[PDB]
Design a protein around this nucleic acid. Structure first.
Ligand SMILES: [Zn+2]
Length: 56
RNA sequence: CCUCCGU
């Protein structure tokens, strides 16, 4: 079963104004009520991009 | 994916 599981948080980004960033606002779509972590605009998952290295 | 800088 699933009990223990690590967490991979890759921080990145920083080019916008926190116009009175509401503690109950969304820092994604700018919607008030839901959090970015719960942004209904976010893409479905699991489905993340891959780096896929190949020469260079 | 894009706008998750707030964990
Ligand atoms: Zn949102």
């Amino acid at each position: 079963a699933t009990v223990v599981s690590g967490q991979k948080q890759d921080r990145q980004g920083g080019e916008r104004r926190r116009s009175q960033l509401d503690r109950d606002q969304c820092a994604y779509c700018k919607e008030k009520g839901h959090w970015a972590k719960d942004c209904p605009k976010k893409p479905r998952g699991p489905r993340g991009p891959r780096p896929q290295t190949s020469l260079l």
